[PDB]
Design a protein that fits this description.
Dephospho-CoA kinase, Rossmann fold, alpha/beta, coenzyme a biosynthesis, dephospho-CoA kinase activity, binds BIS(adenosine)-5'-triphosphate, transferase
Length: 208
């Protein structure tokens, strides 16, 4: 069957997981790109044999599991390897993402993709939701969470797509500048629309 996909994105410290949990509370299955990336290298996964062949047998632990810290460290000391690893994992991530979307039974699925704009992944979504906050909020919340400097978070902000680049591809925008609670009402309104879009998209003769 065809699943209706709502992608969710936002920059660092915007509240992507916070908003995703509110949809999950309403019964929506959430597919998270970062969890999918960890799953393709789990014990017994196909990518593990390729990784051992490329980086060395010692990239694998005693029980057959990936020495994740050792891999992260090896790629940081060999920049070209980062690209080699992403190229190997990409198709596997695409397949696993599709598998999880097909396996979700909620009316529509919420696909949380931090790199949605950077990687042009909005092309694979039926609807795009952006959780938006000011840059100051991004900085303050990340600083509090990780106990890091303003400068450290600014560097991440400058590496990510801009706020305006995310807004330019959004169908809907949810504000998360307020406190942890205006989110429920806004999520409920969006959810009610998503249920309608999902119930009608397969037969919808004309565009919106
Ligand atoms: N590119 C990158 N480079 C380096 N580190 C990166 C990184 N991307 C992520 N991290 C690392 O992952 C953590 C969460 O990611 P994220 O900030 O992109 O996560 P989101 O899913 O957008 O956000 P949440 O985890 O939902 O919320 C983040 C923080 O804000 C708080 N928060 C959320 N809504 C709030 C609200 N309404 N009022 C006050 N605080 C709120 C949360 O408790 C949490 O401390 C970062 O702090 C950093 O450690």
């Amino acid at each position: 069957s065809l699943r209706y996909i709502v992608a969710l994105t936002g920059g660092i410290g915007s509240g992507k997981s916070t908003v995703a949990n509110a949809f999950a509370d309403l019964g929506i299955n959430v597919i998270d790109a970062d969890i999918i990336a960890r799953q393709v290298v789990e014990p017994g996964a196909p990518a593990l044999h390729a990784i051992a062949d490329h980086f060395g047998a010692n990239m694998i632990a005693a029980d057959g599991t990936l020495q994740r810290r050792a891999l992260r460290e090896r790629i940081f000391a060999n920049p070209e390897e980062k690209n080699w690893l992403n190229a190997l994992l990409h198709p596997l991530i695409q397949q696993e993402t599709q598998h999880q979307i097909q396996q979700a039974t909620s009316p529509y699925v919420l696909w949380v993709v931090p790199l949605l704009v950077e990687n042009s992944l909005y092309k694979k979504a039926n609807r795009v939701l952006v959780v938006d906050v000011s840059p100051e909020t991004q900085l303050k919340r990340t600083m509090q969470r990780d106990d890091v400097t303003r400068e450290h978070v600014e560097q991440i902000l400058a590496a990510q797509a801009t706020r305006e680049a995310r807004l330019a591809v959004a169908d809907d925008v949810i504000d998360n500048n307020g406190a942890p609670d205006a989110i429920a009402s806004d999520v409920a309104r969006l959810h009610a629309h998503y249920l309608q879009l999902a119930s009608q998209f397969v037969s919808q003769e004309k565009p919106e």
